[PDB]
Design an enzyme around this catalytic site. Structure first.
Site, PDB file in Angstrom:
ATOM      1  N   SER A  61      -3.350   0.272  -5.475  1.00  0.00           N
ATOM      2  CA  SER A  61      -4.529   0.025  -4.656  1.00  0.00           C
ATOM      3  C   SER A  61      -5.295   1.274  -4.228  1.00  0.00           C
ATOM      4  CB  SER A  61      -4.137  -0.756  -3.410  1.00  0.00           C
ATOM      5  OG  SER A  61      -3.873  -2.084  -3.786  1.00  0.00           O
ATOM      6  N   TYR A 147      -6.709  -8.647   3.417  1.00  0.00           N
ATOM      7  CA  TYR A 147      -6.670  -7.737   2.270  1.00  0.00           C
ATOM      8  C   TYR A 147      -6.472  -8.514   0.972  1.00  0.00           C
ATOM      9  CZ  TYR A 147      -5.091  -3.547  -0.304  1.00  0.00           C
ATOM     10  OH  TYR A 147      -4.921  -2.514  -1.194  1.00  0.00           O
ATOM     11  N   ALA A 315       0.202   0.528  -4.349  1.00  0.00           N
ATOM     12  CA  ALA A 315       1.452   0.224  -5.013  1.00  0.00           C
ATOM     13  C   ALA A 315       1.195  -0.581  -6.273  1.00  0.00           C
ATOM     14  CB  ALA A 315       2.418  -0.533  -4.084  1.00  0.00           C
ATOM     15  N   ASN A 340       8.044   2.092  -5.771  1.00  0.00           N
ATOM     16  CA  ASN A 340       7.293   1.467  -4.680  1.00  0.00           C
ATOM     17  C   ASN A 340       8.192   1.382  -3.449  1.00  0.00           C
ATOM     18  OD1 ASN A 340       5.723  -0.085  -2.958  1.00  0.00           O
ATOM     19  ND2 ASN A 340       5.901  -1.971  -4.184  1.00  0.00           N
TER      20      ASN A 340
HETATM   21  C1  LIG Z   1       6.090  -5.752  -6.514  1.00  0.00           C
HETATM   22  C2  LIG Z   1       4.875  -5.778  -7.449  1.00  0.00           C
HETATM   23  O1  LIG Z   1       4.983  -6.250  -8.540  1.00  0.00           O
HETATM   24  N1  LIG Z   1       3.597  -5.223  -6.992  1.00  0.00           N
HETATM   25  C3  LIG Z   1       3.374  -4.613  -5.680  1.00  0.00           C
HETATM   26  C4  LIG Z   1       1.934  -4.168  -5.648  1.00  0.00           C
HETATM   27  C5  LIG Z   1       1.340  -4.542  -7.001  1.00  0.00           C
HETATM   28  C6  LIG Z   1       0.038  -4.349  -7.500  1.00  0.00           C
HETATM   29  N2  LIG Z   1      -0.950  -3.680  -6.652  1.00  0.00           N
HETATM   30  S1  LIG Z   1      -1.853  -4.559  -5.482  1.00  0.00           S
HETATM   31  O2  LIG Z   1      -1.789  -6.001  -5.769  1.00  0.00           O
HETATM   32  O3  LIG Z   1      -3.279  -4.275  -5.684  1.00  0.00           O
HETATM   33  C7  LIG Z   1      -1.367  -4.227  -3.739  1.00  0.00           C
HETATM   34  C8  LIG Z   1      -1.111  -5.339  -2.939  1.00  0.00           C
HETATM   35  C9  LIG Z   1      -0.742  -5.191  -1.606  1.00  0.00           C
HETATM   36  C10 LIG Z   1      -0.632  -3.919  -1.062  1.00  0.00           C
HETATM   37  C11 LIG Z   1      -0.891  -2.795  -1.843  1.00  0.00           C
HETATM   38 CL1  LIG Z   1      -0.736  -1.180  -1.096  1.00  0.00          CL
HETATM   39  C12 LIG Z   1      -1.258  -2.934  -3.186  1.00  0.00           C
HETATM   40  O4  LIG Z   1      -1.505  -1.766  -3.948  1.00  0.00           O
HETATM   41  C13 LIG Z   1      -0.292  -4.773  -8.786  1.00  0.00           C
HETATM   42  C14 LIG Z   1       0.682  -5.398  -9.578  1.00  0.00           C
HETATM   43  C15 LIG Z   1       1.971  -5.593  -9.081  1.00  0.00           C
HETATM   44  C16 LIG Z   1       2.312  -5.159  -7.779  1.00  0.00           C
END
Ligand SMILES: CC(=O)N1CCc2c(NS(=O)(=O)c3cccc(Cl)c3O)cccc21
Length: 358
Positions: A61, A147, A315, A340
């Site tokens: 993000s 968010y 993340a 993460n």
């Molecule tokens: C466990 C897992 O698989 N994750 C965790 C975060 C993430 C993203 N990034 S995100 O959705 O944009 C995001 C959401 C909430 C909060 C933040 Cl700080 C964030 O970057 C994309 C694909 C997979 C995963």
């Protein structure tokens, strides 16, 4: 590398890596405008490849700060306005709940409860239209913040439509190239795969999977050197010679909404400096999967306040990133890791370092 910077960084990050079992990490400190770099551990555990200053990390993000700035550049060019209705750039979005939802609401997570994730079933341009048509807002626009990738992701896709460019081509031409971010990618090219770190989730090596609006919400990969240059650019936008890009950076650091002690920008989030650490440490905690918060409109938005803590966590499944900077102090930090790990531990480490140096 002044000894004071060397000592605070190593004494903070070494225990963090041990406590969180982070495989590899890169850190940049921007101090009085100049960058200093630090690296630890492994970009690829199995192949024994170390983290270097050229290692690519998934920003997650933190990519939303690039989307926010690209959108600001489109505003400054006169191609879009944040007061524009969403339907002006997507006329096929005819469902009545979209009346009154502006680009500003998409960019700032205030459209009325767009969901955090685009469903995996959504792939095509027609799938995406159907998803947004069927979405039912819980709230009136401009009343609560939730968010959401599906919110700022759609903002990024619509913001580039008047330019005729694809999102990736607009980001390259209008942001990466002018700022000399020559090792920053939405899609990692084969020539750079030797530098692409693996992420690590439950001990398994992983890279982010493709998804709808991934480029716009969480799709950038970058090195610690390019991220330091990103922080320098956001610390001093007036040194940027491209006029609309200078303004776009300033627009992304404007304060549009307030929730508690936090102000929402375009991508960036801000607090008044000096900050109580517990206001940011607990204020960004991602132990919460969904946090709906009432917002107060800042009417009109406050232009970029130099006396701010400007930051963003990011993340993916296998990566954890953090950026924070203080414009009035010419001070900033970037932390890139291929695990993460909890957001409070990122913010705590960043605050210990920047507080020591300010
Ligand atoms: C466990 C897992 O698989 N994750 C965790 C975060 C993430 C993203 N990034 S995100 O959705 O944009 C995001 C959401 C909430 C909060 C933040 Cl700080 C964030 O970057 C994309 C694909 C997979 C995963």
């Amino acid at each position: 590398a002044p000894q004071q910077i060397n000592d605070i960084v190593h004494r903070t990050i070494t225990p963090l890596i041990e406590q969180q079992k982070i495989p590899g990490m890169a850190v940049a400190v921007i101090y009085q405008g100049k960058p200093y770099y630090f690296t630890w551990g492994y970009a690829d555990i199995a192949k024994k490849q170390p983290v270097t200053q050229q290692t690519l990390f998934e920003l997650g993000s933190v990519s939303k700060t690039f989307t926010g700035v690209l959108g600001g550049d489109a505003i400054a060019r006169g191609e879009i306005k944040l007061s524009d209705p969403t339907t002006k750039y997507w006329p096929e979005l005819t469902a009545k709940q979209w009346n009154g939802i502006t680009l500003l609401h998409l960019a700032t997570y205030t459209a009325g409860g767009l969901p955090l994730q685009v469903p995996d079933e959504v792939k095509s341009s027609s799938d995406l239209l159907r998803f947004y048509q069927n979405w039912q807002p819980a709230w009136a626009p401009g009343t609560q913040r939730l968010y959401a990738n599906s919110s700022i992701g759609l903002f990024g896709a619509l913001a580039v439509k008047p330019s005729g460019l694809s999102f990736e081509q607009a980001m390259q031409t209008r942001v990466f190239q002018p700022l000399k971010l020559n090792h920053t990618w939405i899609n990692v090219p084969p020539a750079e795969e030797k530098n692409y770190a693996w992420g690590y989730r439950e001990g398994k090596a992983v890279h982010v999977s493709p998804g709808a609006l991934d480029a716009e919400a969480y799709g950038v990969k970058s090195t610690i050197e390019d991220m330091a240059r990103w922080v320098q650019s956001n610390l001093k936008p007036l040194d940027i010679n491209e006029k609309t890009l200078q303004q776009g950076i300033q627009l992304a650091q404007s304060r549009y909404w307030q929730t508690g002690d936090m102000y929402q920008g375009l991508g960036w989030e801000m607090l008044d400096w000096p900050v109580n650490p517990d206001s940011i440490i607990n204020g960004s905690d991602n132990k919460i999967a969904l946090a709906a918060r009432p917002v107060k409109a800042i009417t009109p938005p406050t232009p970029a306040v130099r006396a701010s803590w400007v930051h963003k966590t990011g993340a993916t499944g296998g990566f954890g990133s953090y950026v924070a900077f203080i414009p009035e102090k010419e001070l900033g930090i970037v932390m890139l890791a291929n695990k993460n790990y909890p957001n409070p531990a990122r913010v705590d480490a960043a605050w210990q370092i920047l507080n020591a140096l300010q």
